[PDB]
């Protein structure tokens, strides 16, 4: 995705402060609480019946770390999210059957979690840069759908 030196610089410095283990865990649990229909892809994950249950579930936490660890990789390849995410795109279409619309919801919940965690430092312009990156990543992941 095309970001300005200022956006890139925003995105990078902020992510240097993200503990992926914890944010991925919060991102994925809030996704499952806020838009429960996404729980369809995680039936074998435990009790996802209350916010508390979803949040403390270790499998949700372990997955969220995987998901944002992969997401972290794309940030370092912000110039070619397509080739970076092409194998996972195919994975999610052909084996996981994930409606790519979920990648957008996750991207928005992630922006929320970054706002909640960083508060005041997650300013309007910072948000803007992250908004283009999650839209970038979602598209890159929906790219091999057919």
């Amino acid at each position: 995705v095309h970001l300005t030196p200022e956006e890139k610089s925003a995105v990078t410095a902020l992510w240097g402060k993200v503990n992926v283990d914890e944010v991925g865990g919060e991102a994925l649990g809030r996704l499952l609480v806020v838009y429960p229909w996404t729980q369809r892809f995680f039936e074998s994950f435990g009790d996802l019946s209350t916010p508390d249950a979803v949040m403390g579930n270790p499998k949700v936490k372990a997955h969220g770390k995987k998901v944002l660890g992969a997401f972290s990789d794309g940030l370092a390849h912000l110039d070619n999210l397509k080739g970076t995410f092409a194998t996972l795109s195919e994975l999610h279409c052909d084996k996981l059957h994930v409606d790519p619309e979920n990648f957008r919801l996750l991207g928005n919940v992630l922006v929320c979690v970054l706002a909640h965690h960083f508060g005041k430092e997650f300013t309007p312009p910072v948000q803007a840069a992250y908004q283009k990156v999650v839209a970038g990543v979602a598209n890159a992941l929906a790219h091999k759908y057919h």
Binding site: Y35, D99, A142, Y145
Partner: protein
């Protein structure tokens, strides 16, 4: 909200569909899978080849449910209760997909009702499919 005229328009275009409701339903599904492939992610267990019995039976179920909403347009939440619990608690289809099927349905009615698909009927049908999508979506969370 559906106007009194919207209801008359819908009952006139649907009445017209009559016995083809099922063939239209299957044609709309084929149109959605071909135009909007991500909707296939909801049917990994179906044979989605053209003419497949599964698509034809599903299309028939889709139309009957639409025929039922026409018949009970003045009280859809209650007429569609069951389907809305099914879409909300079991199938859990993301709500964006409903706009894609309602568009494909509209295209299928356009293609088949040249005399009846006037501007105002088009408008009323679009609103109706919107309301049908709302009702099916209303128990999601």
């Amino acid at each position: 909200v559906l106007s009194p005229a919207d209801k008359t328009n819908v009952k006139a275009a649907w009445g017209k569909v009559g016995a083809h409701a099922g063939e239209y339903g299957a044609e709309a599904l084929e149109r959605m899978f071909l135009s909007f492939p991500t909707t296939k992610t909801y049917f990994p267990h179906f044979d989605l080849s053209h003419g497949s019995a599964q698509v034809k039976g599903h299309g028939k179920k889709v139309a009957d449910a639409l025929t039922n909403a026409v018949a009970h347009v003045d009280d859809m939440p209650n007429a569609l209760s069951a389907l809305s619990d099914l879409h909300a608690h079991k199938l859990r289809v993301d709500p964006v997909n409903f706009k894609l099927l309602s568009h494909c349905l509209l295209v299928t009615l356009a293609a088949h009702l040249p005399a009846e698909f006037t501007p105002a009927v088009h408008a009323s049908l679009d609103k109706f499919l919107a309301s049908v999508s709302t009702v099916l979506t209303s128990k999601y969370r």
